[PDB]
Amino acid sequence: TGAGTPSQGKKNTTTHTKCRRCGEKSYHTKKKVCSSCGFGKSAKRRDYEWQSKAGE
Amino acid sequence: ARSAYSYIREAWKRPKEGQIAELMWHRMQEWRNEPAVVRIERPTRLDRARSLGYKAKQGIIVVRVAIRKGSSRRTRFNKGRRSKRMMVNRITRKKNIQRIAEERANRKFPNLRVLNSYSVGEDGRHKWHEVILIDPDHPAIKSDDQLSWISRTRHRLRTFRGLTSAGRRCRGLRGQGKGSEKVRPSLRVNGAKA
Amino acid sequence: GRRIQGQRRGRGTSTFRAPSHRYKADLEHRKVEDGDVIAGTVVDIEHDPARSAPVAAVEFEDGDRRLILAPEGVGVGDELQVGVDAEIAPGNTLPLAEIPEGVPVCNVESSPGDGGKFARASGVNAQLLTHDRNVAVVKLPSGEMKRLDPQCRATIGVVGGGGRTDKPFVKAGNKHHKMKARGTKWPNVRGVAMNAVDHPFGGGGRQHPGKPKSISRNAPPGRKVGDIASKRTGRGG
Amino acid sequence: MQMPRRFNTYCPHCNEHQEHEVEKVRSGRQTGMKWIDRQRERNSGIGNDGKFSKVPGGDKPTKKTDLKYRCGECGKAHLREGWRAGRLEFQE
RNA sequence: GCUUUACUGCAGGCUGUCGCUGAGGACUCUCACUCCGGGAGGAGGACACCGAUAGCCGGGCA
RNA sequence: ACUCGUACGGUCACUGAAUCCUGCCCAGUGCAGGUAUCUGAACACCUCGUACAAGAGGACGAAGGACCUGUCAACGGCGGG
RNA sequence: AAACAUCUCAGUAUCGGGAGGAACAGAAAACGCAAUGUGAUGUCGUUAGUAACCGCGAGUGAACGCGAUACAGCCCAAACC
Ligand SMILES: [Cl-]
Ligand SMILES: [Cl-]
Ligand SMILES: [Cl-]
Ligand SMILES: [Cl-]
Ligand SMILES: [K+]
Ligand SMILES: [Mg+2]
Ligand SMILES: [Mg+2]
Ligand SMILES: [Mg+2]
Ligand SMILES: [Mg+2]
Ligand SMILES: [Mg+2]
Ligand SMILES: [Mg+2]
Ligand SMILES: [Mg+2]
Ligand SMILES: [Mg+2]
Ligand SMILES: [Mg+2]
Ligand SMILES: [Mg+2]
Ligand SMILES: [Mg+2]
Ligand SMILES: [Mg+2]
Ligand SMILES: [Mg+2]
Ligand SMILES: [Mg+2]
Ligand SMILES: [Mg+2]
Ligand SMILES: [Mg+2]
Ligand SMILES: [Mg+2]
Ligand SMILES: [Mg+2]
Ligand code: NA
Ligand code: NA
Ligand code: NA
Ligand code: NA
Ligand code: NA
Ligand code: NA
Ligand code: NA
Ligand code: NA
Ligand code: NA
Ligand code: NA
Ligand code: NA
């Protein structure tokens, strides 16, 4: 079975959804964790220094 | 004449001799069965405590913390590393056990601030330290001309920023002359070379 | 290279775990205050999914209902006893001291009260040889002479289900069904049939182990494969 | 080759010819307290030790003469250029 | 990426030593400590575990 | 984790239904056992050195190695004259 | 470093914890232009690419002092009550 187009047909599973805390469609309803703000994993807000250039 | 306190001090100079030696052998048995952080009504080394700032007063807390002995509990590298950085066994943390003890106690009492701490011995694998914490919100402390300084907002979370007793010594701030070039005023300001 | 299969095992992932939730009971000798008075009646005989051997359901006098590691010859209605003064019949459990030497025994405790550790698989049994006030010498199924505290409890008789190993599996499918009831990864790909990256015997233009198969006791995991600290190999001599 | 144990020759100390005695330089024992010794201890740590992880060079097919010429009257010795010699045996 | 008796190191295993650790080149005991027991108590015991260090093995890994 | 498991177990490998069979080799390499003697680190101990210290040397000697033995359905070998 | 292992990139990137409006440091068990001398602490200029480190390779790299800025000095533990 082709890994491309033919394998795209079984994709009717809902995972990432609108997050209660940040509003982004990143709340993974299976994991109950937002990949954008960290809701469900961290009280503190998700954020990293690599999200911007080193000297900025 | 000699203070009664001077006798507690004298005994602790050699914790493996005389009566104290036997107390320890007794005590540790119960300590080893106790938790990581245990609040105690009275300081095991009263002279030590009073000397550090302890007072039989409201808002003053003492707690004994257990910490494992030894070097860094380190995970081996999972990617490329030059030989110099492949190390595991001999690496040791830059923060001493007493300091770890102070932080663990402090986290257990989020509202209190660490005043100071001292050692109360060790066995083959634990090290025990008693930490003196203070309630900066309790009047009685707010009204004490000797401890009120710790109530200032600038002192929130002293231990975590190395403003503690053991914190400052462990940071190399002991000496005011030779040897403290990369230490004072801070390790970070000196590029982290001490 | 990559971690070898024996290393994937230790992580305890689904593939390597036993289907515990599907198991029936943790066969252990009952605890008796003392006196031995404790007796019960066999209410049924069931299949043990964790041992491919039968097991017995027992109702004890004090209301307790527990499955038991069943020796051969136990049936519904029988009355089993557990205690120092228990009669000496198959199916009963008592300390090696109260057991007459020369009697076959099973589900022997390693240390008094641990509930039984030795001789529990299909049709096996231990052999109580010597007594004493200090040591009870038992011969385990492997043939070893084990010195045990005479206070260690045991069950009279040989474990039920003897002869299971006598029948060949005949086909892959039958192994399959059994393997599905154990904490094991099956089937087994030979190391020499793998790539160098996957196993110390992997690689090569043809199939053969790279070095000799006998590996030192001190070899680290990832390398300890083949014949571990073999004192000898082959059949000759 | 052969070489006389004693012979007349210039003594740079006496500043005049005198009988000298020839001897092969016996190696002196190390004290282990030189700077290089302290640097080895100091600088060796986890991983490769740089220069201190190196091992003993090798050998030239023939070594040069390594001798001491000792004045027979003032007792002071001096050193000279050596020359390649597969073997050096003294006469008497 | 892979290999190995390439170079150099790093995990891991084995082993001595020190600390925990106590009483009277082989020995007893019990009090720490470990395990078994619901408890009473039983087994083991200054060893083991753990911390430190030393020697050997060490493409398992860099 | 294996394991609600306990040698009729389960781990680690090789070969690959049945049938007839599976010879010779333990020197090398590997594993394992033994070991008078030899070698074998550090601590403690002894000697020299230093009013101390660095350092040099000795005594003792674990695992390991030398040495001996077992082992090929262990890596493998089975020629020239 | 014309490869590379110590070294270098660098205590940098990145990660964990936490404060404030600024942090941190701070009234000598200091300095050691050795003195009949200086006098808490930051910071700026300089000292100086000096001393020191280093397959003594490539590289790395202070401080005292001085001229400035701003200046500030105190509280416990104990003795005796
Ligand atoms: Cl704090
Ligand atoms: Cl099976
Ligand atoms: Cl010569
Ligand atoms: Cl000055
Ligand atoms: K590098
Ligand atoms: Mg794909
Ligand atoms: Mg600053
Ligand atoms: Mg069970
Ligand atoms: Mg079979
Ligand atoms: Mg069938
Ligand atoms: Mg399965
Ligand atoms: Mg297969
Ligand atoms: Mg293939
Ligand atoms: Mg490999
Ligand atoms: Mg084949
Ligand atoms: Mg083959
Ligand atoms: Mg090194
Ligand atoms: Mg337990
Ligand atoms: Mg490699
Ligand atoms: Mg380069
Ligand atoms: Mg170069
Ligand atoms: Mg640097
Ligand atoms: Mg200076
Ligand atoms: Na706190
Ligand atoms: Na430093
Ligand atoms: Na192979
Ligand atoms: Na150094
Ligand atoms: Na590649
Ligand atoms: Na051979
Ligand atoms: Na052999
Ligand atoms: Na280059
Ligand atoms: Na290159
Ligand atoms: Na260097
Ligand atoms: Na001047």
DSSP state at residue A49: G
- Cis check: omega of the bond before D56, within 30 degrees of 0: no
Instruction: Assess D75–B contact: CB distance below 8 Å, yes or no.
Output: no
Is C111 (CB) below 7 Å from strand E? yes
> Which experimental technique did the depositors report for determining this structure?
X-ray
Among C41, C74, C77, which residue's Cα sits nearest to residue C59? Answer: C41
Pair type for strands C214-215 and C227-228: parallel
Q: DSSP characters for B127-173?
A: EEEEEEEE-TTSTTTTT-TTTGGGGSGGGTTGGGGT-SHHHHHHTT-
CA of D57 to the centre of ligand 32 (A): 25
Q: Report DSSP state, residue D13.
A: T
> Which residue reads 């059994």 in tokens?
C178
| CA separation for the pair C198, B19 (Å, rounded) | 62
How many angstroms separate the CA atoms of A16 and C159, rounded? 55
Distance CA B130, CA B43 (A): 7
> Tell me, what amino acid is at A16?
H
User: What is the secondary structure of B50-114 as a DSSP string?
Assistant: HHHT--SSTTEEEEEEEEE-SS---PPPSS---GGG---TT---SS-HHHHHHHHHHHHSTT-EE
Q: Are D22 and D67 in contact (CB under 8 A)?
A: yes
CATH number of the domain at A4, please: 2.20.25.30
Closest CA to B47 of B2, B98, B6, B1: B6
CATH number belonging to domain D1-92: 3.10.450.80
Q: Which two tokens stand for residue C92?
A: 């009963």
Strand partners, C67: C57
Number of CB atoms found within 10 A of residue C69's CB: 24
Q: Tell me the helix, strand and coil percentages in chain D, rounded to 5.
A: 15, 35, 55
- The tokens describing D52, both together, are 């201190």
Q: Residue B38: in which H helix or E strand, if any? A: strand B37-39
Rounded CA-CA distance B117/B169 in Å is: 13
CA distance A38 to A52: 18
Give Cα separations from B162 to B32, B77, B95, C78 (angstroms).
28, 29, 10, 74
Outline where DSSP puts E strands in D1-92.
2-4, 6-11, 16-24, 67-71, 77-78, 89-91
Judged by C1' against the alpha carbon of B54, the nearest nucleotide is: G77
Q: Which of residues 57-96 of B touch D (CB under 8 A)?
A: 82-87, 90-91
CA D50-D55-D56 angle, to 5 degrees, is 140
Query: Computed over its alpha carbons, how large is the radius of gyration of chain C?
Result: 22
The dihedrals phi and psi of C125, each to the nearest 5 degrees, come to -170, 160
Mention every residue, 6+ apart, whose C-beta is less than 8 A from residue C13. none
Task: Tell which of D43, D44, D46 to mutate to test the B interface (max B CBs under 10 Å).
Answer: D46
CA angle B85/B86/B89 to nearest 5° reads 110
The position carrying tokens 């892959």 is: C172
Asked if C69 contacts C159 with a C-beta cutoff of 8 angstroms, the reply is: yes
Domain range annotation of chain B: 1-194
Single-letter residue type at C39: A
Q: Which residues 34-53 of D are in CB contact (within 8 Å) with B?
A: 45-48
What distance in Å separates the CA atoms of residue A21 and residue B178, rounded to the nearest whole number?
A: 54
Q: Which fold has domain B1-194?
A: Ribosomal protein L15e (3.40.1120)
CB C106 within 8 Å of CB C154: yes
Give CA–CA dist B108/B45, Å, rounded: 22
Are the beta carbons of B180 and B173 closer than 8 angstroms? yes
Domain count, chain A: 1
Q: How far is the CA of C212 from the centre of ligand 30 (A)?
A: 11
Q: Give how far D58 is from chain B: nearest CA, Å.
A: 27
Is the Cβ–Cβ distance between C90 and C56 less than 8 Å? no
Could you give the CA distance from residue C82 to residue C198 in angstroms, rounded to a whole number? 52
Please report the resolution in angstroms: 2.4
Q: How far is the CA of B176 from the C1' of G37 (A)?
A: 20
C-alpha–C-alpha distance, residues A28 and A41, integer Å: 11
Task: Reduce the secondary structure of chain C to three states and give it as a string.
Answer: CCCCHHHHHHCCCHHHCCCHHHCCCCCCCCCCCCCCCCEEEEEEEEEECCCCEEEEEEEECCCCEEEECCECCCCCCCEEEECCCCCCCCCCEEECCCCCCCCEEECECCCCCCCCCECCCCCCCEEEEECCCCCEEEECCCCCEEEECCCCEEEECCECCCCHHHCCCCCHHHHHHHHCCCCCCCCCCCHHHCCHHHCCCCCCCCCCCCCCCEECCCCCCCCCCCEECCCCCCCCC
The HSE-up count of residue C121 (CA atoms within 13 Å, CB side) is: 6
**Nucleotide closest to B178 measured between CA and C1':** G63
Q: Was A27 annotated as part of a binding site?
A: no
Listed in sequence order, the residues at least 6 apart from B103 whose beta carbon sits closer than 8 Å to its beta carbon are: B159, B160
CA quadruple D35, D38, D43, D47: dihedral positive or negative? positive
Distance CA C96, CA C84 (A): 10
Q: B53 with B132: CB under 8 angstroms? A: yes
- Owner of token pair 């005023």: B185
Q: What DSSP element (H or E) covers A17? A: strand A16-18
Whole-number Å distance, alpha carbon D49 to ligand 33 midpoint, is 9
Residue B50, phi then psi, degrees to nearest 5: -60, -35
- Residues B102, B108, B110, B112: is their CA dihedral positive or negative? negative
Angle between helices B5-13 and B18-31 in degrees, nearest 10: 80
- Phi/psi zone of residue D47: left (φ > 0), alpha (ψ -120 to 50 degrees), beta? left
Q: What is the DSSP letter of B8?
A: H
Residue B39 and residue B63 in contact, taking contact as beta carbons nearer than 8 Å: yes
- Cβ proximity of B181 and B193 under 8 Å: no
Domain extent, residue A49, equals: 1-56
List, in order of start, the domains of chain C with CATH numbers. 1-78 (2.40.50.140), 82-159 (2.30.30.30), 160-237 (4.10.950.10)
Residues lying close to strand E (Cβ under 7 A), chosen from 59-88 of chain B, are: 68-71, 76-77, 79-83, 86-88
DSSP code for A37: T
Give the Cα separation of C87 and C37 in Å (integer).
11
Q: Which residues of B touch D47 (CB under 8 A)?
A: 82-87
Surface-to-core class of residue A32, CB atoms within 10 Å of its CB (0-12 exposed, 13-18 middle, 19+ buried): exposed
Q: What residue segments make up the domains of chain D, in order of their start?
A: 1-92
Residue C58 φ/ψ, nearest 5 degrees: -125, 140
